[PDB]
Ligand binder design. Structure first.
Ligand SMILES: *[C@@H]1O[C@H](CO)[C@@H](O[C@@H]2O[C@H](CO)[C@@H](O[C@@H]3O[C@H](CO[C@H]4O[C@H](CO)[C@@H](O)[C@H](O)[C@@H]4O[C@H]4O[C@H](CO)[C@@H](O)[C@H](O)[C@@H]4O)[C@@H](O)[C@H](O[C@H]4O[C@H](CO)[C@@H](O)[C@H](O)[C@@H]4O[C@H]4O[C@H](CO)[C@@H](O)[C@H](O)[C@@H]4O)[C@@H]3O)[C@H](O)[C@H]2NC(C)=O)[C@H](O)[C@H]1NC(C)=O
Ligand SMILES: *[C@@H]1O[C@H](CO)[C@@H](O[C@@H]2O[C@H](CO)[C@@H](O[C@@H]3O[C@H](CO[C@H]4O[C@H](CO)[C@@H](O)[C@H](O)[C@@H]4O[C@H]4O[C@H](CO)[C@@H](O)[C@H](O)[C@@H]4O)[C@@H](O)[C@H](O[C@H]4O[C@H](CO)[C@@H](O)[C@H](O)[C@@H]4O[C@H]4O[C@H](CO)[C@@H](O)[C@H](O)[C@@H]4O)[C@@H]3O)[C@H](O)[C@H]2NC(C)=O)[C@H](O)[C@H]1NC(C)=O
Ligand SMILES: *[C@@H]1O[C@H](CO)[C@@H](O[C@@H]2O[C@H](CO)[C@@H](O[C@@H]3O[C@H](CO)[C@@H](O)[C@H](O)[C@@H]3O)[C@H](O)[C@H]2NC(C)=O)[C@H](O)[C@H]1NC(C)=O
Ligand SMILES: *[C@@H]1O[C@H](CO)[C@@H](O[C@@H]2O[C@H](CO)[C@@H](O[C@@H]3O[C@H](CO)[C@@H](O)[C@H](O)[C@@H]3O)[C@H](O)[C@H]2NC(C)=O)[C@H](O)[C@H]1NC(C)=O
Ligand SMILES: *[C@@H]1O[C@H](CO)[C@@H](O[C@@H]2O[C@H](CO)[C@@H](O[C@@H]3O[C@H](CO)[C@@H](O)[C@H](O)[C@@H]3O)[C@H](O)[C@H]2NC(C)=O)[C@H](O)[C@H]1NC(C)=O
Ligand SMILES: *[C@@H]1O[C@H](CO)[C@@H](O[C@@H]2O[C@H](CO)[C@@H](O[C@@H]3O[C@H](CO)[C@@H](O)[C@H](O)[C@@H]3O)[C@H](O)[C@H]2NC(C)=O)[C@H](O)[C@H]1NC(C)=O
Ligand SMILES: *[C@@H]1O[C@H](CO)[C@@H](O[C@@H]2O[C@H](CO)[C@@H](O)[C@H](O)[C@H]2NC(C)=O)[C@H](O)[C@H]1NC(C)=O
Ligand SMILES: *[C@@H]1O[C@H](CO)[C@@H](O)[C@H](O)[C@H]1NC(C)=O
Ligand SMILES: *[C@@H]1O[C@H](CO)[C@@H](O)[C@H](O)[C@H]1NC(C)=O
Ligand SMILES: *[C@@H]1O[C@H](CO)[C@@H](O)[C@H](O)[C@H]1NC(C)=O
Ligand SMILES: *[C@@H]1O[C@H](CO)[C@@H](O)[C@H](O)[C@H]1NC(C)=O
Ligand SMILES: *[C@@H]1O[C@H](CO)[C@@H](O)[C@H](O)[C@H]1NC(C)=O
Ligand SMILES: *[C@@H]1O[C@H](CO)[C@@H](O)[C@H](O)[C@H]1NC(C)=O
Ligand SMILES: *[C@@H]1O[C@H](CO)[C@@H](O)[C@H](O)[C@H]1NC(C)=O
Ligand SMILES: *[C@@H]1O[C@H](CO)[C@@H](O)[C@H](O)[C@H]1NC(C)=O
Ligand SMILES: *[C@@H]1O[C@H](CO)[C@@H](O)[C@H](O)[C@H]1NC(C)=O
Ligand SMILES: *[C@@H]1O[C@H](CO)[C@@H](O)[C@H](O)[C@H]1NC(C)=O
Ligand SMILES: *[C@@H]1O[C@H](CO)[C@@H](O)[C@H](O)[C@H]1NC(C)=O
Ligand SMILES: *[C@@H]1O[C@H](CO)[C@@H](O)[C@H](O)[C@H]1NC(C)=O
Ligand SMILES: *[C@@H]1O[C@H](CO)[C@@H](O)[C@H](O)[C@H]1NC(C)=O
Ligand SMILES: *[C@@H]1O[C@H](CO)[C@@H](O)[C@H](O)[C@H]1NC(C)=O
Ligand SMILES: *[C@@H]1O[C@H](CO)[C@@H](O)[C@H](O)[C@H]1NC(C)=O
Ligand SMILES: *[C@@H]1O[C@H](CO)[C@@H](O)[C@H](O)[C@H]1NC(C)=O
Ligand SMILES: *[C@@H]1O[C@H](CO)[C@@H](O)[C@H](O)[C@H]1NC(C)=O
Ligand SMILES: *[C@@H]1O[C@H](CO)[C@@H](O)[C@H](O)[C@H]1NC(C)=O
Ligand SMILES: *[C@@H]1O[C@H](CO)[C@@H](O)[C@H](O)[C@H]1NC(C)=O
Ligand SMILES: *[C@@H]1O[C@H](CO)[C@@H](O)[C@H](O)[C@H]1NC(C)=O
Lengths: 957, 273, 49, 49, 49
């Protein structure tokens, strides 16, 4: 790790990606460390062997190297060099002369001349690179300079490098290497770092196309990758064979002196089955083994063989459990039938085909190719039982493991699932039946802090290095740590996991609540002074509208495509009409919702508040600019944690990703919620808290305001107001705590909101990230490029293969629009709720339980957020309760009993005298006669007091 | 993107539903039927543990409803033929255990039911259920009578109506119950036939010679096998993307019903509207 | 943005969230809806309406 | 066309008429539309290999 | 505009539409206003000139 590898490059046949994360196959085996230290002109010949004069470092296996890589560390100067490639067929050399003359020096001309045997040939270099920083070669013969591959040689037995450098610090490396599977991070098309996909955790990480996957749950399938025993089962019928054999005897007179592909002594290649009448030979016995047959005497470097044709079934594999209704194989042509070609290669350099094997066939269940040559009256049914295997059972193939079962099921012979995969079969012999379990069912694993821990499995076994496999209902679970049940660092509804992977059952949230206080003339407790708290919510409010141009998107600028589309304007008009009408509708709504008050916007000055110091919420002043308002602190923190086309037809930069989309035809409109009027709205709402009805326009101290809001819940009756002064110290502290949380259940609430915001943003992006990808694939056409399609075809057959592109593209587009409408029609509900609660909680305290916070509600702040709002519901929670002894009513000496005018009050005997308090606060109020009401019938269960002591309680007379 | 979306949505919704379920041990004990009185709401109260260390058991109206309506541990082992659900696992669909498990569900329901007979008292003891109804009545208006005929009359109609409606399970109220039952069987059918439609589509081959990839490899050499293979997956991925795009549209809409439910349970259940 | 008319900012005959257009095509920045509302009337033993 | 018999026609020459015909209607409501004006003549040909 | 063209007809290889709005290619160039006023049996030969 930490290797710069500035010279080191990627390899790509096609266009290179830039600044992306990509997993791929690269030749990155360290092999010999250097193998070229002190490189001189006599570099020698190395042939994919450990025969490299260098320090391998002992980490090199030295078995074989798939490719050879040359890394050059020289100043940017031209130094004479030659390249020699040795192959059995021929020796090819690369030379370049600085001087104008073709011979030049041993205008720059480079000639590579390749000579085979005693014949010498001359080749043309053509383009010559100004500077080459890296060189790549391979055994296959692919040639790569700076990643792209110019051309591929047929084969290279050995490679010799003729590079001569006077400089002692000649170069950095010429090494061997092999393929591997890795991941890479690329910036400006240049590598930054890589990750070998060897360990299980690394495997998952690479699969994630990212690094540092967040702690959570993932699924994996570990699969065996080796040959397995093969099992076959068929219906027993005494095999009657048919052998089809063919005798290709190419036997030419070498072919290296004049021509190999000239078909010399190529002649008779035939199979005994031909008839003088030469009726097509179709087998009758079901069992037949097709075989290629013997081959002609083979000489060095050249051969001939059969090739796959256009038929469904490849010859040679036909014998592998195939079905057919009528083979009818013929040597000459057969009407309406497939044919195959045999070709010959001279050192993989000449290809000459021969008309061979006309075959036509009917489908059927009678004829079936059998691999095993022996066919006769014999008993065989190989069946490996309890291991992973391949299988062919009654013409159905697959892989898995076989289990004996006990089920009569004498109705039939094969049982298949709804999906089409067979589940079990019954032997013809006796009646036993066997199930077919799949080899590697998916396993569920867990990761935390970028390491794997714990695992949900299916088998009572320790697959990984975990030391314990605790059996649990509905599943098994492995873990490598003891059980101490300290706490949970991850959770799911049923259960949570410990830090070390120990599993724990969740205990739901311990809470407590209150209820009606039935008058009972007995001991009861009322809440005393409370403490403040803050709760955070988030509501989706808007969706970034998108608009599409039908004709750009599908036509892509071809006039003929536009004209073929011209007859479909009835169709695609509806798409853009719907999108446009919906966009203007929703934008009209969101613009109708945003009010403003200049009277109150000025009040947002922090000097007006007091000890609360809600600095974060208040909008920022203009930064020496003529801007009405600026985003608040919690605003840019949120945005931080989370182009002009003017520059997309002009400029000198390469186009950006967003810019590209415009070219294709998608077009994201500017968002409805712009910052200027958004901030004015938020600031006006915030300033509506400190403004109360006054004859003058001036403000009043914030402290008085809170008291008034409290009066709403009940008549605060104290003259020295301790609450105003105590709750602020908790309030500003809670606020600093929560802004720190941005940068205690409240904490999990904030985590939930943040998770929801990143959720909606991902949900928005990957919609068009899915859209713009589908035009890269051609549904049925030869190629995606309409222009290329026109180039490759004349007027009659070009439009015919064109139109099936647009026939698919329109469907994809209609899918996209039908899902966008389904996003708008649903977000409208969230808009309704948001407008329904902002004007309720934000303006006037609610008496509705659970709508504004856990408990009684005082006031709420609001700020903006991406496509949404965020609230700050300040509430009250009881610190302690005060007990007290009450009376459910009063009885005078006369029959008349008195009660209270409204329920929310309650008498009690505080001391000698009686005091009547509120039911929701401990504030006490003086007794008086006006607070009572008369009812004739006296209940004994109340206070029993006569008219005499009545004067002692209320001054009646 | 497919599995990333499904997984993130699942963990999100499960976090929400786990955030909504509170509990009170003080009040759960109060669910003892002895505390109520003439009402005899026997059906609602949760059942006691059946000689087991289980916090709670489903109530009568619960198992009646379920009645009227597997482990993979046994799907790699055993001697039985695989079940339909078991088969789905083999294919690759996997239904997670439901968020609303019976233990904490029953604790939540029982605690809510016990929050009715509990009123603010200096002690933790209960008071007669009769007094409670009177207090709730006072909210609508100051009930002013000393000999409370309502407490004693309405219960005889109440328990009779309850026996009538549990019989209806096993008068507009009747059609209301019929509507609810129809809605439950509706949602259950609506849930099942989604994957009943999904798992059927791989049985058909869009353009390939046959569905079996293994057979396709058997029938062809390396050059022309992958070429006819890939058009299978090109269709299968589309079907899968359709399925995910419809599941997200189920979650985003059920979220509204969740909002309404939480908005009315804490309103009607706790304090008269 | 092209237009064939002078800028006099009289009024808007069409509108989008960011901006609205004049009758002759002149572009204008929208001023949100001038409104006013009320709030709690804290007892303060002073002038009020 | 009314009862399969012509009533009137609109030549697709002017830009506004072009948009109107594209709308498959007459009198499109005041609003926003998108258009692509394209050259329709031979252009110089460039090659690189 | 306002030409009745009652005789004038559409041209369609396939089945004719009825009472619809359709954009299409038609041979509608005015060219020679009349070119046949007072037509008699000796109308002569005109060859796209
Ligand atoms: C630009 O475009 C060119 C187009 O030609 C690309 O070049 C081709 O790249 C592909 C992919 O890398 C390459 O296929 C690979 O070839 C190498 C070498 O093949 C020989 O080695 C194997 C052993 O691995 C030997 O068995 C035998 O000598 C192989 O030759 C044979 O190939 C097939 C398949 O083996 C045989 O049936 C033939 O008979 C023929 O003789 C292989 O290393 C690589 O093999 C991997 O896949 C095969 C098939 O599934 C598998 O059998 C191997 O075991 C191996 O799979 C995994 O096994 C290793 C074990 O170490 C494990 O570590 C990894 O998981 C492996 O993936 C595969 O066959 C192809 O040959 C190249 N073209 C030519 C003509 O050379 C070039 O890459 C492009 N560049 C880019 C990216 O832009
Ligand atoms: C019933 O079904 C019958 C089936 O046959 C329909 O008859 C066919 O109708 C089509 C469509 O109208 C018609 O295609 C058109 O032909 C005329 C005449 O073609 C000759 O004129 C051009 C100049 O326009 C000359 O270049 C040359 O003489 C043309 O002949 C040649 O056609 C092609 C294409 O030009 C050549 O490559 C061949 O070599 C051959 O010699 C054309 O006027 C019309 O041309 C338009 O499209 C082409 C191709 O894109 C383009 O190159 C032209 O410039 C022109 O495009 C636009 O240019 C004009 C410029 O004034 C502009 O004003 C408009 O925007 C134009 O659209 C096209 O080729 C076809 O020939 C008819 N069939 C036969 C066999 O005659 C009949 O219409 C159906 N009736 C209905 C509707 O029910
Ligand atoms: C993927 O590759 C890119 C390219 O190297 C990585 O980004 C680069 O990351 C480095 C730190 O790893 C950044 O440097 C930091 O930049 C700030 C701001 O300039 C500077 O103050 C710091 O001292 C430090 O230099 C660098 O800006 C950044 N460049 C680019 C173009 O992204 C990226 O981290 C890699 N990611 C992985 C997972 O490998
Ligand atoms: C509103 O929600 C909050 C958070 O869920 C509740 O806060 C908490 O209230 C519970 C009482 O139900 C407090 O519990 C107790 O704390 C004491 C002291 O630690 C402990 O001895 C008790 O055994 C019990 O655990 C809890 O401390 C408190 N937590 C916080 C962070 O404030 C609040 O009560 C809810 N209000 C209502 C009306 O439900
Ligand atoms: C409810 O909505 C309506 C319409 O948005 C509001 O009506 C309007 O109230 C505003 C005050 O916020 C009035 O504004 C003023 O009018 C006078 C006289 O023209 C002018 O001198 C002031 O400078 C200011 O522009 C406006 O005339 C009035 N319009 C109508 C059509 O009634 C209503 O006030 C809103 N109510 C609340 C409580 O927000
Ligand atoms: C498309 O073509 C149709 C067919 O001509 C047009 O409809 C016809 O429009 C005329 C007026 O332009 C209508 O005449 C009015 O009818 C009423 C009721 O009979 C009569 O009281 C008026 O004095 C006048 O005659 C006529 O009814 C109507 N006929 C049909 C079959 O639609 C249509 O306006 C044309 N649209 C365009 C955009 O060209
Ligand atoms: C899981 O537990 C095993 C043993 O219980 C740990 O294994 C040791 O790991 C090191 C590093 O590979 C080996 O050298 C030892 O031989 C292992 N011991 C045994 C007994 O196998 C393993 O490290 C634990 N891993 C985690 C993540 O807990
Ligand atoms: C490379 O080593 C192998 C194994 O010894 C050998 O067959 C081969 O000949 C060596 N290379 C050359 C070029 O001889
Ligand atoms: C090119 O080929 C000719 C003929 O074989 C040979 O004389 C000449 O040396 C070659 N050029 C080189 C090797 O640069
Ligand atoms: C690159 O070449 C310079 C030339 O002097 C040498 O000093 C240095 O060690 C080389 N770096 C490598 C090979 O990484
Ligand atoms: C086929 O050709 C070869 C060589 O031409 C010859 O030996 C053989 O007899 C011929 N016939 C058969 C049936 O193989
Ligand atoms: C089938 O079974 C016989 C008996 O053991 C064995 O000789 C033969 O090799 C087996 N075939 C295969 C393909 O394993
Ligand atoms: C599971 O494995 C444990 C390991 O000791 C063993 O004791 C137990 O019997 C096993 N149970 C089953 C059902 O295989
Ligand atoms: C952890 O385990 C040790 C030993 O079993 C025990 O003494 C301790 O109390 C445990 N602590 C926690 C937090 O689980
Ligand atoms: C939470 O609830 C469980 C449930 O029994 C209880 O045992 C425990 O006392 C509670 N713990 C806390 C920290 O509230
Ligand atoms: C509760 O009420 C009783 C009356 O029976 C009284 O004696 C007792 O002091 C009360 N409890 C408290 C804590 O005041
Ligand atoms: C409540 O009031 C008492 C007495 O004034 C005081 O000691 C206590 O700290 C207060 N608690 C809070 C949370 O303000
Ligand atoms: C109080 O206001 C000052 C003014 O900028 C600010 O720096 C400080 O952080 C604020 N303190 C709190 C607790 O908000
Ligand atoms: C009235 O007093 C009686 C006395 O037995 C008591 O049982 C009843 O609850 C009382 N009713 C009230 C206070 O409404
Ligand atoms: C108060 O109640 C006592 C207890 O029943 C009763 O004896 C007495 O008469 C009552 N006093 C009144 C109603 O003034
Ligand atoms: C109900 O309470 C009674 C006494 O109050 C007790 O005997 C009985 O066990 C309780 N029921 C349960 C289920 O605990
Ligand atoms: C009353 O309670 C008993 C106790 O089990 C029950 O059997 C009976 O059915 C109940 N009656 C009604 C009407 O609920
Ligand atoms: C037979 O099959 C049944 C169900 O398939 C199973 O319960 C039983 O254990 C099996 N074995 C015997 C011996 O019955
Ligand atoms: C229109 O422009 C004229 C000249 O610039 C100016 O006098 C007049 O006040 C403007 N009126 C409006 C409504 O913009
Ligand atoms: C509307 O608001 C703007 C904002 O500054 C203000 O200048 C103007 O006085 C208001 N106009 C009307 C007609 O209310
Ligand atoms: C037209 O046909 C008539 C006979 O039908 C013939 O008398 C006359 O000469 C023809 N016209 C010309 C110009 O030939
Ligand atoms: C039509 O005019 C052209 C151009 O002068 C001429 O070539 C052609 O011959 C004329 N028509 C006839 C029928 O001669």
């Amino acid at each position: 790790s930490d290797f710069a590898f500035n010279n080191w490059f990627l390899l790509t046949n096609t266009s290179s990606v830039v600044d992306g994360v990509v997993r791929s196959f690269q030749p990155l085996l360290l092999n010999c460390l250097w193998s070229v230290s002190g490189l001189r002109f006599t570099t020698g010949f190395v042939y994919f062997n450990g025969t490299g004069r260098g320090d391998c470092k002992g980490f090199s296996s030295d078995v074989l190297s798939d490719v050879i890589r040359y890394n050059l560390n020289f100043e940017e100067n031209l130094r004479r060099g030659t390249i020699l490639f040795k192959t059995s067929y021929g020796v090819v050399v690369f030379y370049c002369t600085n001087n104008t003359l073709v011979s030049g020096d041993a205008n720059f001309y480079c000639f590579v001349n390749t000579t085979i045997g005693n014949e010498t040939t001359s080749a043309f270099v053509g383009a010559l690179p100004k500077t080459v920083r890296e060189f790549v070669i391979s055994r296959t013969g692919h040639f790569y300079i700076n990643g792209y591959r110019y051309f591929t040689l047929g084969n290279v037995e050995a490679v010799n490098f003729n590079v001569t450098t006077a400089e002692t610090t000649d170069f950095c490396t010429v090494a061997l290497a092999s393929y591997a599977d890795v991941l890479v991070n690329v910036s400006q098309t240049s590598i930054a770092n890589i990750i070998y996909c060897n360990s299980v955790i690394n495997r998952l990480r690479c699969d994630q196309l990212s690094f540092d996957v967040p702690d959570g749950f993932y699924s994996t399938s570990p699969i065996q990758s080796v040959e397995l025993p093969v099992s076959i089962v068929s219906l027993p019928v005494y095999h009657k064979h048919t052998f089809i054999v063919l005798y290709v005897d190419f036997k030419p007179q070498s072919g290296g002196g004049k021509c190999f592909n000239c078909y010399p002594a190529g002649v008779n290649i035939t199979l005994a089955n031909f008839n003088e009448t030469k009726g097509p030979l179709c087998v009758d016995t079901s069992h037949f083994t097709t075989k290629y047959v013997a081959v002609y005497a083979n000489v060095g470097r050249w051969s001939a063989s059969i090739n796959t044709g256009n038929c469904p079934f490849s010859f040679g594999k036909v014998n592998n459990f195939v079905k057919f209704g009528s083979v009818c194989f013929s040597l000459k042509d057969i009407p309406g039938g497939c044919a195959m070609p045999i070709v010959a290669n001279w050192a993989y350099s000449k290809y000459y085909t021969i008309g061979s094997l006309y075959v036509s066939w009917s489908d059927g269940d009678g004829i079936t190719g059998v691999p095993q040559p022996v066919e006769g009256v014999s008993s065989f049914m190989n069946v490996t039982l309890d291991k992973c295997t391949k299988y062919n059972i009654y013409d159905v193939s697959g892989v898995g493991v076989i289990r004996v079962s006990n089920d009569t099921f004498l109705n039939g012979i094969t049982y298949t699932s709804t999906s089409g995969n067979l589940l079990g079969f019954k032997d013809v012999t006796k009646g036993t039946i066997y199930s077919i379990t799949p080899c590697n069912p998916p396993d569920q694993l867990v990761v935390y802090q970028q390491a794997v821990v714990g695992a949900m499995l299916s088998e009572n076994f320790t697959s990984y290095g975990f030391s314990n496999v605790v059996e649990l209902p509905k599943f098994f679970y492995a873990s490598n740590g003891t059980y101490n049940c300290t706490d949970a660092v991850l959770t799911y509804s049923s259960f949570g996991v410990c830090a070390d992977g120990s599993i724990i059952a969740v205990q739901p949230r311990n809470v407590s609540y209150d209820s009606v206080s039935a008058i009972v003339t007995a001991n009861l407790s009322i809440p005393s002074n409370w403490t403040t708290s803050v709760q955070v919510e988030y509501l989706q409010i808007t969706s970034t509208p998108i608009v599409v141009d039908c004709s750009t998107y599908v036509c892509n600028g071809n006039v003929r495509c536009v004209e073929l589309l011209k007859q479909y304007t009835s169709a695609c008009k509806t798409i853009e009409d719907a999108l446009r009408n919906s966009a203007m509708l929703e934008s009209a709504d969101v613009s109708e919702m945003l009010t403003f008050d200049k009277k109150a916007f000025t009040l947002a000055n922090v000097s007006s508040f007091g000890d609360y110091n809600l600095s974060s919420v208040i909008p920022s002043l203009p930064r020496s600019g003529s801007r009405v308002a600026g985003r608040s602190a919690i605003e840019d923190i949120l945005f931080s944690k989370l182009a002009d086309y003017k520059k997309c037809t002009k400029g000198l930069s390469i186009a950006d990703l967003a810019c590209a989309q415009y070219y294709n035809g998608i077009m994201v409109l500017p968002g409805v919620a712009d910052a200027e009027r958004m901030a004015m709205y938020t600031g006006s709402l915030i300033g509506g808290i400190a403004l109360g009805g006054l004859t003058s326009a001036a403000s009043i101290p914030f402290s008085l305001a809170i008291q008034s809001r409290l009066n709403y819940v009940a008549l605060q009756t104290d003259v020295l107001q301790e609450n105003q002064k105590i709750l602020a110290a908790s309030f500003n502290k809670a606020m600093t705590n929560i802004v720190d949380a941005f940068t205690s259940q409240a904490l999990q609430t904030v985590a939930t909101a943040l998770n929801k915001i990143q959720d909606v943003v991902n949900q928005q992006g990957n919609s068009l990230n899915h859209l713009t990808s589908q035009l890269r694939q051609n549904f049925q056409a030869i190629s995606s490029s309409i222009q290329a399609i026109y180039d490759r075809l004349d007027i009659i057959q070009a439009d015919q293969q064109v139109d099936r592109l647009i026939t698919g593209r329109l469907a994809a587009l209609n899918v996209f629009v039908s899902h966008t409408l389904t996003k708008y029609t649903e977000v409208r509900a969230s808009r309704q709720l948001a407008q329904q609660k902002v004007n309720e909680c934000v303006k006037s305290q609610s008496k509705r339980y659970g709508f504004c916070g856990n408990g009684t509600h005082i006031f709420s702040l609001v700020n903006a957020a991406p496509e949404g709002l965020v609230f700050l519901h300040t509430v009250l929670l009881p610190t302690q309760y005060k007990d007290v002894e009450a009376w459910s009513g009063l009885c005078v000496d006369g029959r008349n009993g008195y009660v209270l005018r409204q329920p929310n009050l309650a008498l009690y005997k505080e001391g000698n005298y009686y005091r009547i308090t509120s039911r929701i606060m401990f504030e006490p109020r003086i007794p008086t006669i006006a607070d009572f009401v008369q009812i004739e019938n006296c209940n004994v269960t109340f206070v029993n007091i006569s008219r005499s002591e009545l004067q002692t309680i209320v001054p009646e007379y």
